[PDB]
Write a protein that binds this ligand. Structure first.
Ligand SMILES: [Zn+2]
Ligand SMILES: [Zn+2]
Ligand SMILES: [Zn+2]
Ligand SMILES: [Zn+2]
Length: 638
């Protein structure tokens, strides 16, 4: 590592373009950027010295000239209008920045950007105002508490990452290869290893909850020689998470449990929070089932401490020959398409993760415009030629149809859905339907769906333009609808089931693998008055896919090794018009619209035949080279 020889040349030109009166106390790399500390604020020299050094710079005051938290926290409630209504105020010393939250962020941000600098001087801390979210999230609060109490660790973490990213100047890769450790010709445990002769980055690291009883099918291949080498030698530069779902980020905290990695995890803020929530959710579902969890809160916590967030469009160097950029995937809040600029730029890779290419209630179609692009890795969940989804609006009509029939017949509607994803989407469908007077019976929300929902309201900028304004700007907010009733605990859950009142029940998780939805299913499945509606992809080996297949008698190993058979009499429906996955038509259209036209396309994340079908179809229609690799396949990209 010749990092300090690089830092030496920087400290030379910086101490040549910076006011020597401006007592520079330090210059070092912290995360994906150069930071210059100075005890003397003050502009437009950053814009320069930055484009001169060809690096991302950030000037700040020495952490010493910063008024303590418990102190400057009262000086602020003094220097800002009481009408500004400051709901919360947090600190993040790892960046010397004060996060100020208020219902009326205008009177706190300075009626002329003034009060912003007004308080900035009185405490030296970097102010950042945030409009109070309409719903408070335990997850968000928890992450905030961790970031201000772990300041010591993170500041050290950011120095290590920085010295690592710039272990050498911009390098042109000699070779590039991608290895599927999981998620090739199957849905589950997505894990792809990007390799160059200088770097190693992991894109996604999921688990296959549908196959939890089989460690050989549930986890990415830890037995891959190249991967054991990368971990054991400490060569993994980074991990990039496309989105919050467990089959894309679920094994991430396992890596910390066993101290196999302590580098950076790059992802969008919404993803960092949703991920943390689904991971906590996961290990709790396991314990509530009497199983030993894959990891513990202490590991999920380590994940948070090792995560560096980027918003879409932010280009960042994550190693000597790899620059990252995230783009909207339109799958779920915060979902991204990973774009890796590698070496010379003549062999760039775009990794789709899961994506949607038409608008939905919460999101806009995936980005299809990139700078330079040679290889496109895309999902195939609906890759079969006949995998056309039901039109958005016909699905809505079908849903309403079914709810009416069931609610009349004196029954209940069970809609299994993941905490994040279809839950929110379906909620919007029922909410807009409520506003015209269609919701008579109550709508219960079980399985952390409400907490996830809270996270959405805190990231309006990651929602579609339509819903963005409708949220933060207006006082009215769709999720806040009085039609949704969060299930408080196991007693109420049981009350709900025993009660004779018809109702709509939306509960995690989406494939009946675990969580409240399995309880509802089991106790409601016998009565033919009830209805269960699948609105998401049912993976192979899930109870959900069994029910969906029509199997009317399902065995379930219960407590004390005794198996129990649930008799299925309730109505089984499938409405795929709410899917977060691009359907066959969308996938093919995506390839058509993507620009620049990729020289190669690799199909993944889909049942075997679907991956091949899509790959064959893309080649036949667009004449582009394609391939549906197997796990453990490695493709050299030249
Ligand atoms: Zn997903
Ligand atoms: Zn997925
Ligand atoms: Zn080429
Ligand atoms: Zn209640």
């Amino acid at each position: 590592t010749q990092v300090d020889q690089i830092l030496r040349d920087i400290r030379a030109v910086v101490n040549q373009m910076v006011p020597k009166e401006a007592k520079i106390t330090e210059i070092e790399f912290e995360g994906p950027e150069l930071v210059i500390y100075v005890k003397n604020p003050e502009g437009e020299l950053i814009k320069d010295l930055a484009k001169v050094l060809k690096k991302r710079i950030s000037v700040r005051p020495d952490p010493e000239v910063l008024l303590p938290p418990e102190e400057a926290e009262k000086l602020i409630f003094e220097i800002v209008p009481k009408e500004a209504e400051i709901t919360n105020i947090a600190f993040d010393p790892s960046v010397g920045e004060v996060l100020i939250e208020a219902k009326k962020p205008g009177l706190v941000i300075g009626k002329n950007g003034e009060t912003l600098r007004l308080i900035t001087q009185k405490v030296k801390w970097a102010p950042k105002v945030v409009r109070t979210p309409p719903l408070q999230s335990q997850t968000i609060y928890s992450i905030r508490q961790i970031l201000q109490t772990e300041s010591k660790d993170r500041r050290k973490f950011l120095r290590q990452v920085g010295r690592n990213i710039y272990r050498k100047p911009e390098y042109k890769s000699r070779w590039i290869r991608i290895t599927g450790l999981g998620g090739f010709r199957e849905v589950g445990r997505s894990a792809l290893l990007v390799q160059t002769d200088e770097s190693f980055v992991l894109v996604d690291f999921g688990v296959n909850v549908a196959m939890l009883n089989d460690p050989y099918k549930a986890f990415p291949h830890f037995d891959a020689p190249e991967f054991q080498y990368v971990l054991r030698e400490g060569l993994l530069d980074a991990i990039i998470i496309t989105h919050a779902h467990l089959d894309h980020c679920g094994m991430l905290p396992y890596l910390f449990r066993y101290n196999l990695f302590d580098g950076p995890i790059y992802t969008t803020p919404p993803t960092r929070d949703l991920m943390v929530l689904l991971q906590k959710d996961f290990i709790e579902i396991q314990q509530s089932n009497g199983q030993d969890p894959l990891y513990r809160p202490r590991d999920i916590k380590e994940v948070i401490k090792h995560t560096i967030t980027l918003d879409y469009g932010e280009v960042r160097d994550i190693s000597p020959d790899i620059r990252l950029t995230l783009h909207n995937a339109g799958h779920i809040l915060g979902s991204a398409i990973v774009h890796l600029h590698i070496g010379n730029g003549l062999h760039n890779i775009a990794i789709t993760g899961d994506f949607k290419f038409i608008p939905t209630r919460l999101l806009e179609p995936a980005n299809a415009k990139f700078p330079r692009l040679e290889t496109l890795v895309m999902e195939s969940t609906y890759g079969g030629a006949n995998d056309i989804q039901m039109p958005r609006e016909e699905a809505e009509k079908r849903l309403i149809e079914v709810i009416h029939n069931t609610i009349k017949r004196g029954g209940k509607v069970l809609i299994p859905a993941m905490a994040v994803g279809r839950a929110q989407e379906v909620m919007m469908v029922l909410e807009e339907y409520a506003r015209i007077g269609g919701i008579e019976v109550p709508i219960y929300l079980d399985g952390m769906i409400w907490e996830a929902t809270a996270i959405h309201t805190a990231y309006p900028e990651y929602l579609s333009r339509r819903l963005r304004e409708q949220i933060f700007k207006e006082g009215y907010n769709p999720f806040l609808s009085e039609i949704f009733h969060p299930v408080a605990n196991s007693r109420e859950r049981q009350d709900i089931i025993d009660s004779n009142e018809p109702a709509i029940i939306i509960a995690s998780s989406g494939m009946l693998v675990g969580g409240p939805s399995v309880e509802y299913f089991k106790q409601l499945a016998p009565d033919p008055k009830n209805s269960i509606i699948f609105v998401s992809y049912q993976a192979e080996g899930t109870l959900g896919r069994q029910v969906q297949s029509g199997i009317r008698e399902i065995p379930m190993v219960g407590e004390e090794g005794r198996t129990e058979v649930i008799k299925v009499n309730m109505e089984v429906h499938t409405i795929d018009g709410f899917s977060g996955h691009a359907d066959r038509r969308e996938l093919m259209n995506y390839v058509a619209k993507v620009r620049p036209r990729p020289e190669r396309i690799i199909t993944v994340h889909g049942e075997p035949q679907k991956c091949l079908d899509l790959a064959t179809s893309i080649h036949r229609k667009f004449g582009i080279s394609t391939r549906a690799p197997n796990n453990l396949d490695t493709i050299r990209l030249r």
